[PDB]
């Protein structure tokens, strides 16, 4: 996943709140989430990826090996089976909790670091550049 390490801003955000509310996101939370300019820090040592989400409002950090299912705490405060794998190219996360499920795929487009979070067909595209 060498693509994908360094330090990247968000630059747009769509339909991020009707996803958070697909996944069951509180108001003052999605409020929150919102407002906030994370940057995304992905690095990569051996075969131990980590990806750290970081603004003034949250810090989220996971480290995990592709294909190796990782308990996870999310931002929104659930607590998730993830397995995360390199799938055409981008990098796919899907949790899982209570019966449901969510994917997450990181992507290289040209410049940018593409974001896409999906819940039963309620999608959210988040594009991040290059700090
Ligand atoms: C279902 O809930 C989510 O998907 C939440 S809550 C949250 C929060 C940030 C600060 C407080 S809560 C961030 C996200 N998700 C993304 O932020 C996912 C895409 C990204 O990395 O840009």
Redesign the pocket.
Known sequence: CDAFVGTWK?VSSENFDD??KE?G?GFA?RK??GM?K?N?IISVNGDLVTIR?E?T??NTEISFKLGVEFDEI???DRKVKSIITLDGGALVQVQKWDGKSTT?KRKRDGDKLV?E?VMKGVTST?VYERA
């Open positions: 968000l996803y958070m996944v996101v939370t929150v989430a906030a994370p995304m989400s603004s409002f949250k999310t931002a929104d997450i974001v979070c988040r």
